[PDB]
Design a protein around this ligand. Structure first.
Ligand SMILES: [Mn+2]
Length: 206
């Protein structure tokens, strides 16, 4: 895959998130409704090898829903900056849905990314895989001061979490730009130290 580098900051409260979305209103591009689902063996073979296999179902708020398969490998997350190798590929929506119900059916897709999972992690098929479940996220996308901001409201059983992300080749300068703005506007933030999947799997608020 290619390297995804992003600024990743946590917004500390629902009020902070609301204030930020209000402030960013003029810059709004689109709102995405995402359902993230994840797959691994019962022995956590992918996780143990620093890999996450996600099927994301998405819908923009013609607008057909989409399913994107992602393999993310060898992530780092430190000081508000994420770097991870990512491979993504669109698959048919109805096929993705079938796989959530019956993970073995991942074996029946002619997918580039799923072939890469088989080859790189030593599987001949997905008969041994389970669905770990998943969670919903609402992503607001803004075009602001030359960057694309993604503001996330992530819905877990144990509560919601809120983040601001920005994919960029200049993560230090962009992180500074964002932090200065949040500080001036008195919005509560910190570095994000956990991925959404890691929060999900922990079963508790970070
Ligand atoms: Mn992200």
């Amino acid at each position: 895959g290619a390297m995804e580098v992003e600024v990743k900051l946590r917004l500390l409260t629902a009020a902070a998130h609301l204030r930020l979305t209000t402030l960013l209103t003029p810059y709004h591009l689109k709102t995405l409704h995402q359902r993230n689902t994840f797959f691994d063996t019962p022995k956590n073979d992918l996780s143990l090898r620093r890999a996450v296999l996600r099927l994301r179902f998405l819908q923009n708020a013609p607008s057909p829903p989409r399913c994107i398969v992602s393999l993310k490998a060898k992530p780092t997350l430190a000081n508000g900056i994420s770097r991870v190798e990512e491979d993504e590929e669109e698959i048919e929506y109805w096929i993705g849905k079938e796989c959530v119900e019956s993970p073995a059916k991942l074996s029946d897709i002619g997918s580039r990314v799923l072939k890469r999972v088989k080859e790189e992690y030593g599987f001949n098929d997905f008969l041994g895989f389970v669905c770990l479940g998943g969670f919903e996220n609402v992503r607001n996308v803004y075009e602001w001061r030359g960057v694309k901001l993604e503001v996330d409201e992530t819905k877990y059983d144990f509560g919601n979490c809120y983040e601001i992300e920005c994919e960029t080749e200049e993560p230090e300068r962009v992180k500074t730009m964002i932090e200065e703005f949040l500080t001036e506007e008195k919005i509560e933030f910190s570095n994000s130290d956990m991925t959404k999947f890691a929060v999900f799997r922990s079963g508790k608020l970070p």
